[PDB]
Structures are given as structure tokens and as C-alpha cells.
Design a binder for this molecule. Structure first.
Ligand SMILES: [Cl-]
Length: 214
């Protein structure tokens, strides 16, 4: 249900910059997170890109894109990651076929997650990795939880930071388009496709990252 609750708070160092990577979920969170980090005099490079994921690595390789971004800017010391909504499907590699959630599939996906973390560590950067919050479609939601377990396990092993989102975007342990705001009033945080964020939802995601910074 919940692997662990991450209470880590990072102290930010002068001149250090942020890099965002991920899919259209990160694009939506990025709008809010950029504004919040801008307000703290922090520079942001936002590479988030629609229709990407670790499972689509042959179409767009986030490990290559991330490595190149660090190469172009030695001042990036914080990597923020939110992806996976496009990823929970069988993977074919040549004649080899890997059914989603099978042991070999998990090996491949875990390796792709680890590659991202190792690239940040090689460039002396720390990693904030968002848990994908629940989604409305039951079948997709079940698969997303497999992804989130992998992210959390890899982040734990590499001693980076995992941003818990499941509780904050759930009501009575299930998906909800609405949550309570800071004053206990109901606010719409998910768009009607049951996946993406409203502006208020994006700000709530951004707040969860900011709660891992001091
Ligand atoms: Cl997307």
C-alpha cells in the first residue's frame, strides 16, 4: 500500500539549479513548481515532454536527454522526476517480449529507473522523484502502483528522495477528483480525464516537493 513515508528535507545551496524531466504530468506540475521555485530565487530548466516515458525509450530516451542537460549546465544539482503514466504496457525488444509486471519486465523497467538516478549521482545531483498519484481508471491505477513500487524501491536503494502523493490525492483510500484545501474546503485537483491536474492540483503537487526542502 505504502512502502515508506519519506521525511527527508534537503538544505539548498547557493547557485544550485533545478532540472525537471518527465511526461505531461510533470508538464502540469512544472507550471506550479516553477512559480514556487522562482519565488525562492531558484533557476529551473524544464525539459518535461508530452508522450514520453521510460518504456518508450526507443522513441525518446530520458537517460540521454538527462545526461546531456547536465553536460550543458554544471550548476544543475537537483533533478525532479514525474513520469510513468504512459509506461505500464508490454515491451517488445527485437524478438524478445516482456509482459507488463513480469519478472523480466520489472528487471528492464527497474534498470531504466536506475539509469536516471545514476546519471544524476554521476553529476553530483540529488533526485526528487514523485509518486504517481492515483488515477480514475481502475485497471490503469493498479498498474501505476507497480510503477510506484519500483520508483520507491530504487529511490530508497540510492538514498534519494521519494515524494509521497498517494494519501494526499486519495479520499478514503481511493481516487478522487476533489480534495480538501488548506481551509478544509473542497477543491477540484484532477482534470476530467482522471489523470492530469487542474492548476490547484498542480500547486498541491508542488507543495509536496517544497515540503522536502528547507
Ligand atoms: Cl504524456
Amino acid at each position: 500500500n505504502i512502502s515508506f513515508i519519506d521525511n527527508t528535507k534537503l538544505e539548498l545551496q547557493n547557485g544550485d539549479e533545478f532540472l525537471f524531466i518527465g511526461d505531461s504530468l510533470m508538464q502540469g506540475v512544472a507550471i506550479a513548481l516553477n512559480r514556487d521555485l522562482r519565488n525562492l530565487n531558484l533557476k529551473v530548466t524544464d525539459l518535461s515532454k508530452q508522450n514520453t516515458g521510460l518504456s518508450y525509450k526507443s522513441y525518446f530516451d530520458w537517460s540521454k536527454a538527462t545526461n546531456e542537460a547536465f553536460i550543458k549546465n554544471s550548476n544543475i544539482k537537483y533533478l525532479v522526476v514525474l513520469l510513468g503514466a504512459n509506461d505500464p504496457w508490454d515491451i517488445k525488444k527485437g524478438g524478445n517480449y516482456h509482459r507488463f509486471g513480469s519478472l523480466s519486465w520489472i528487471d528492464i523497467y527497474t534498470s531504466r529507473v536506475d539509469e536516471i538516478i545514476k546519471i544524476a549521482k554521476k553529476h553530483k545531483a540529488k533526485v526528487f522523484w514523485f509518486e504517481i498519484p492515483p488515477v480514475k481508471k481502475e485497471d490503469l491505477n493498479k498498474k501505476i502502483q507497480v510503477l510506484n513500487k519500483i520508483y520507491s524501491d530504487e529511490i530508497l536503494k540510492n538514498k534519494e528522495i521519494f515524494i509521497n502523493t498517494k494519501l494526499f490525492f486519495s479520499v478514503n483510500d481511493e481516487y478522487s477528483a476533489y480534495i480538501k484545501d488548506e481551509n478544509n474546503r473542497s477543491i477540484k485537483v484532477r482534470t476530467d480525464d482522471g489523470v492530469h491536474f487542474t492548476p490547484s492540483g498542480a500547486r498541491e503537487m508542488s507543495k509536496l516537493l517544497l515540503e522536502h526542502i528547507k
